[model samples]
Target chain A: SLDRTTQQPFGNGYLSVEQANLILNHLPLEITFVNKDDIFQYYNDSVPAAEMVFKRTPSQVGRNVELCHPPKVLDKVKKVFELLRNGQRDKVNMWFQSERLGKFVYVTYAAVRDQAGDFQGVLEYVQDIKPFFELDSE
Target chain B: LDRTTQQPFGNGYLSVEQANLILNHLPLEITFVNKDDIFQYYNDSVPAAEMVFKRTPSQVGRNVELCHPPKVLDKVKKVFELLRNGQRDKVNMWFQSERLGKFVYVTYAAVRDQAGDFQGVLEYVQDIKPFFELDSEF
Candidate 1:
């Protein structure tokens, strides 16, 4: 049950908007996409804002990516984006052990490019790795 | 060099190269099987040996039934049937193994067009062992 605008075709095949949204929301990772213009374009609503590893809101969409991080990290964030935009790095990954949350959180920022290898955007994905480690220890 | 050969992707457009890069860089291993039950595509996110369900390049375009062992073929068929017939939108499962030293999460989602015609099935797999390995308080 979809209209023309609701049926989206990606590189491989087709998926309805509902299907795509549900799939993204069900993923354990929180994902965000910032366009080449540095606009915060999309984020997966994987959990409630308070429960999210990095809280986000619908109102934040279309906001500048620079405003998305803490003031202390803004310089580092700018450097990371610079590296990605200039093709110096395809990805930058970082992780931290969070005592407050009692979890090991992994975060990645990857440059998205077109077929011509031109930068188009960036994708950020975050995940909590503690459950997987617990399962391994068990 | 501006590449005008962009293909529609959701509400946007991206070149095939960009699409492939984005898919391969995701943390999850993903596979697609068309409605006719043929294995179509898989994201090369990690080395073959590291994948939760190892797949090879040669396996693409093969019948999905041949992708599994005879022991689990029945369950696989049933799952696909339910998805393609709209009986289920998604199926999720998890497994852990001391031998492999990992806990894995898996999801299979039905792909449908705007008109609700079944297009394919998307399978996503992730090994979550690394997340749980934080031993120190920070």
Candidate 2:
């Protein structure tokens, strides 16, 4: 259940377009959703090009995910897809420190499923976690 | 000046590590622009990557006005001014994209700290085409 008081279209898991936009834009993260076929589907524009650990271009959409990563990284993505297709996994979580930017990146990928438990696609998210270090010391 | 260190999405304010994990798991594109209108950071959950909306690494750190054409720059500037001044907490804008043949929904929100001072603006762009599905007669 969601906090219906926050926006209209209120309950039953339904949200008005405006409400959805408000939530998505305000959430503290970066987001991307892909179709089951692995085609790029959608993303938010809350984050700018310069600050991401790795910048992604609009050209990446409608293409295979393999194109977005280095050849060596393709195998890792492939494994996640395989595990997801087999129902052995529904999510993958990992973190890395970027040498180029000196930032810690936290990433996750989940299998997006519909009412019938049918897999629709993958929802991937990467967060710039450098902001966390300061808090850790405090 | 920390007022409350808590996570609005969870039980309390989020620790940096926890916030990182939570943010990277979200489902939309989230971009942040600083008070000065400079690109700040964006999460990588959705497809703001498609050239249809023009998101890329090179544009990071650039004045957001440069991300748009001369025709729309004035509107963008005005929205930022209002948000920064507390005159508006949010601005909702909609348009139809011929490139994707879909209606796009965008919302701009004022990002403020716990002290109630403005920090920057957050922009959220999403494809509202799916909402039309709900309008169909069951």
Candidate 3:
């Protein structure tokens, strides 16, 4: 007889995407994106990019993400290296099609590769999409 | 500087031999060489080295072609040229060998100096035999 009380969703067997995404968003940024040119372009400004910020202003665009942090973080910059070097995914992108923090937000990260499929840089887009989920027609 | 003293092992930097020993001790098989295609170091795991490399670690630091039988030599040169040009870091492949009766994942990366010079190349080879299974292997 297993103790059902202490059993966690994952260890007990399996959990849903809801639990997984929740943990991912709450923790530091583990998500990443890059273009074909291999530039230090864009990444999650949320938990995965730099450090999660309450928000990013529209005026704060165009700065290279590599410059956003100090040199101490360069060692970790290898995530970009591994991603591109491995060519794991072309034009890699991740979006939060679900909800967190009471409001459902959709965030996207995409890579910009050249015609030869070489890395260039990346682009990021984010939006609060909760209203779309709220249906109220009679 | 004394060449035969233990002091060379002190500071974080080590002589080629010491560095090679440390590199060989890791779980993954690795090969480190100089730009001139001189064999510097390699971890000698029976499964990874003997099967994947075919030659001993002492032979790894030389031109990589010596490891491959002669048919696939052209592709190897192309990969090295790509790395030397800083176009790519990984030369990855998986092969099924009737001789070994398994598949393996292999990767090669170029090491660079501070000036962005392609100092040498390193090869990482691993027997994915255990990971080939979904659940039973771990």
Candidate 4:
């Protein structure tokens, strides 16, 4: 149901550098922190520093994840975000198999909560397992 | 842009970890607060984040009810309610000012889970003063 936007849909507020480093940045093999919200805060920063993604922008950093996305992508992102926020068992992941790039990017997002089970937020990890799987034959 | 200098510690500063790693000359202060308003963090620069948050965590979670002067307290409560109810995932703000005779921007925000849940909060301080005078990284 990537079409409907669920009500409020809480999330783990923001993570401390220590928390983010352990829970996110390091979890993914390659990715640069960009923009995000509770609904969706992870993506594959596959483009190298070389990409200069002059197109991509570093968010104000601590801004709400919802305000990060451009309006066009909001609805789609919200759908997946709500699915996780509204349920107790909330973890989702996806693997993009690109035959053309010969790369498989596996992305996983998990729910974070406190000892009380109150929703905290989601942690996202984007990994590139392409090189691991497609080793050049000696 | 010159890779040779950036040495990539990011702003390319090599200093004792305890000292100003990036803003060696900066005197701005930092005040960190958790999502619960439990005065648990602070990194006083020079002028100090203390100016922004005057009180210390002497009593811990006690004065919670009296922290805000009502109006602002209401706003804080609304955010907590929204977050607890799974209404929002993150919140943030950025303000610019002149403290050490230069313009600086401070930002803070809450974290969230995939389902738009609230996690915690983080505050970041950056003294953008040095960059203002740079013309292209010599």
How high is the CA lDDT of each candidate model?
A: 0.70, 0.59, 0.43, 0.39
Off by over 4 Å in 3: A1-138, B1-21, B47-50, B57-62
Q: In order, what DockQ does each candidate have?
A: 0.18, 0.03, 0.01, 0.02
TM-score, cand. 2 vs. native = 0.47
lDDT of 3 by residue, B9-33 (tens): 1111222222222223233455554
Q: Which of the numbered candidates is closest to the native, going by highest lDDT?
A: 1
- A73-99 in candidate 2: lDDT tens per residue? 888988987777667887887777787
- Residues B19-91, model 1: lDDT tens digits: 4555666878877776678876666566666666767667676899877888999999899989988999888
> Per-residue error at A78 for model 1, in Å?
0.9
Whole-structure CA lDDT of model 4: 0.39
TM-score for chain A of every candidate model?
0.85, 0.77, 0.38, 0.53
lDDT of 2 by residue, B1-138 (tens): 121122232111222222333333354445667667787555554545442466667767688887788998889889999999899988876777788775666768887654778867877665545434433567
Better by TM-score, candidate 3 or 1? 1
Q: Assess every candidate by TM-score.
A: 0.65, 0.47, 0.41, 0.33
Per-residue lDDT tens digits for candidate 4, residues B1-138, read 121121112111111221112111122333334446553334333443425434344523343434446668877676656545555534433344545453444434454444544544444454434333333557
Q: Candidate 3 lDDT, tens digit per residue, A21-115?
A: 22222222233333333433222323332223233332323344554446865455546445645567532323343433554444434343433
The positional error of residue A26 in candidate 3, measured at the CA in angstroms, is: 30
Off-target runs (Cα >4 Å) in candidate 4 are A1-27, A30-56, A98-102, A132-138, B1-138
